[PDB]
Amino acid sequence: NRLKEKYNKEIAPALMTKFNYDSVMQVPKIEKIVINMGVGDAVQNAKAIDSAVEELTFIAGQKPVVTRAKKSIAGFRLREGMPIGAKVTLRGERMYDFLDKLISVSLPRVRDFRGVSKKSFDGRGNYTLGIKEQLIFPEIDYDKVTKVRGMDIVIVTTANTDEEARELLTQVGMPF
Amino acid sequence: MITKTSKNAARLKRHARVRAKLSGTAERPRLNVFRSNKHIYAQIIDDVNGVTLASASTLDKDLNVESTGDTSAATKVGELVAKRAAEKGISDVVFDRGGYLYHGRVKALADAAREAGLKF
Amino acid sequence: SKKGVGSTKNGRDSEAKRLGAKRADGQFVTGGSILYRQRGTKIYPGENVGRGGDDTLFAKIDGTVKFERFGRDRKKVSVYPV
Amino acid sequence: MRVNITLACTECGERNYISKKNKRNNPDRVEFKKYCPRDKKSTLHRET
């Protein structure tokens, strides 16, 4: 709730008069957040899928999809199927809640934390957080952690060029 | 970037899937449905002649409704479709739900035309 | 001298199946008669022509036969009455 | 392996049908409702 009001009131006039848009609708909005999991031990660890079907339901209560491999790879011992990786897409109120979890609460707990990279924008206006330790925001509970499998967060704006997505995500609260 | 295609582009595609299997023949004219945000529209089309025979819209200042986008607006425009289809006597017609479900305002149109006397 | 090498390995071949036009353009054609034996749809069914289970194009009604075209680069059989 | 399957009726007991199935992908005795021309209706059939 609070990040929407922060976004509207503080950000939309400031970003609108910072980048001089020809309409109110050109102002970029964070549309969706995609949480990749990328568990490839489903082949080698048949139970492991429940790991991050267990964990990513607790990471965000939208249950991730047990996603399947679309092409057979012989070097990985894997036919089409044998499902690989979980996936959350996120738009609504929980997503500004999730960036509220990331910015203000979680990103201190990165145990080697510095400026997360400026050079992680694709050239279109979208961002990914590459996570190496799956316990960052306090729900994850070391007690309930054996497999350390991290996470990929894909923050997707509606930005047409890239540095205005930069100036969006700096102003929302992501440090760099 | 992220860009999405329109409702209208996917709607015309999902309509063009529908159009391969039913057309506005003689004595089964095609009863088409368009679903604007603020109104709803319904034509009765011959596809051999390329001519719509009867028509009814909620964009009619006569016999207006308040909400105009409600399911009751769709029921009133469906009975108007069938009423104009009764005044020019086709009496038997084939329902084109146009790239939509058979669910809401479209199903309200269709149920209203089935009640008022268009034999789908 | 006759030094022995054998084993062609390539004798066999399948039996010729007679795909292609069985009726022509402007031909009078009764109902149910095969207009075009094919594999795939090299030519599509148009008006009053049905595509079979072995995707042959057959005529549903009596009438003349026309091979028109489907616009861009694509053909069509259609049977019209008189 | 793939086995030839007769599908005998239950209302009539008459055989009337054959299709094939696996002994491994379908290890149990399979049943369908088909048309019994003695019963002149749709009837549950049964592998025998």
Add this chain to the structure above:
Amino acid sequence: MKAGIHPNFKKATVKCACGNEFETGSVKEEVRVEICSECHPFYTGRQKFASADGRVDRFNKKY
């Protein structure tokens, strides 16, 4: 939203050991935190403890 599949979400009154409170919506109704942002010392400019501690040995000639 599918019913019976997702866990619940209540208004999380996220605390911190520095006392700073914040509001989100989570699985947990209330969350206790040991280090928030405003508690973490990197956000608070040049910190007291670790920047006063992280002085390398000044070539201990003294005696």
Add this chain to the structure above:
Amino acid sequence: MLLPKRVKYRREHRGKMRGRAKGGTEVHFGEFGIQALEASWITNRQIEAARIAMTRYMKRGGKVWIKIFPSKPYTAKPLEVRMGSGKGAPEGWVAVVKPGKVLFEISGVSEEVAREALRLASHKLPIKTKFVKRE
């Protein structure tokens, strides 16, 4: 030994030699070239011997520019074997040379040396050939 590294079908028909060449009828990579006045099959070894004669006479070649490559294989049954029982095993590779096809070219070298260089190339070829300047 110019060899295509891979061929779809190792045994092809012998084809026919009629009509002029589709292309390469004119010299544009080099300065001085050699056309075929007749049609033939030129094997690996004729391009080898001609190109070696070219390189040995020019003694420092600007560019040598071989336009024909032996794509077609020709098969041959072994010696003293009756007819039939399959096509023979492949022995060699052949460039098909239609009439009016620029075979070799020369750049950066004067006209008389190019004449005599393409002449030593021409006496290794089965064809009647002529010298061709750039137009």
Add this chain to the structure above:
RNA sequence: GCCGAGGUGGUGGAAUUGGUAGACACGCUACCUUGAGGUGGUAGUUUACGGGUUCAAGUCCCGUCCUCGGUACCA
């Protein structure tokens, strides 16, 4: 070049897809015994190759290399 056969540890060599640097007999290494050797006693070292199939590969399959032999030019 063609056909047929085998390519394991230093050696000869068994292994019907199911655990082998080796399971079996020798060598080999470290120790013991003996004055010092031998015998004897104790412990110890990826299947010609590369790419698959498989939950599992020496094995099943596709290709490359080597050696035995038969089948040829020639002396």
Add this chain to the structure above:
RNA sequence: UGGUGGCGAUAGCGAAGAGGUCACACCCGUUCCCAUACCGAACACGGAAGUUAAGCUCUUCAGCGCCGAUGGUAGUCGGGGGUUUCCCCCUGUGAGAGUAGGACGCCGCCAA
């Protein structure tokens, strides 16, 4: 303007513009119908705070794409001749490539 059709992208792509009171939309939410292998993104159910930026229309233009001659040529039916794994001549036919150019919408129907 909005919907719906036929016509071979001469309709396209791409580039630069303009328009909103109506109209189509972008939008605002899910309380019920419905939905999302995840999710009001979609699909549905509703609304009208603002938005001409996008779709949408409406102009130009030949950068890619498309259509595309005439001539000439390769080929070839038929006749003929030669040193005949080929070549030449005659009557008729006649590409492909390349081009000059055409083209960034024509034509219907219905509702405003």
Add this chain to the structure above:
RNA sequence: GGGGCGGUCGCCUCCUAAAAGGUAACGGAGGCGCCCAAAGGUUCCCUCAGAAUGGUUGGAAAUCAUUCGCAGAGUGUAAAGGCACAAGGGAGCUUGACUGCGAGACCUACAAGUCGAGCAGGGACGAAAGUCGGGCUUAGUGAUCCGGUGGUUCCGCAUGGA
């Protein structure tokens, strides 16, 4: 291209094959003697491979978003033909992988083989229109004789049975 050896014997796809169809050789290549209870039916949905970037362990290449991609992918399986209105992908519901047929056609010496609108009986899906008599088409198979099994207002050596 003497006979033996080798190789082959039936069916499907391409090239030979000469722009209908056909067409031979011990011509060039390949496959078949099946698989699938969903890999069938219908309804509703929807779009592929790669590349460039952002991304731990993730590697050249799993999964992710993100633009560009009317086609290389996919199509159970050789190969051809065909397909993005899907024939390619999902999910629900399902058994038409129905019975009696079948005007008329293709094919062909025959035996055979293939296509078939439509009708009736009963259903499946769908609101309906409709579609469904297996799969994307073409391979996945063999006559008769003799026996087995199941069912039948059939006959049954004088009659009733057998």
Add this chain to the structure above:
RNA sequence: AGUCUUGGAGGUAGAGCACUGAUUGGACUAGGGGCCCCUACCGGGUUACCGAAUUCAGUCAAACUCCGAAUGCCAAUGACU
């Protein structure tokens, strides 16, 4: 039955590279070696020693077609013969 007019199906000869294979050279070009320097194979420094993928320009194909004949073939339509 022939021929003229007309409508079709079919993709060879030819041609072209738009697929699929083959393939000549130049331009760059991640990278693989080799001379080595020290040195945790770490960081590099070079070479006209090879180069995957990009581009321009050229070739070729029975099982390659963005294309496409002349003929032959199937017809109808009249016309004669």
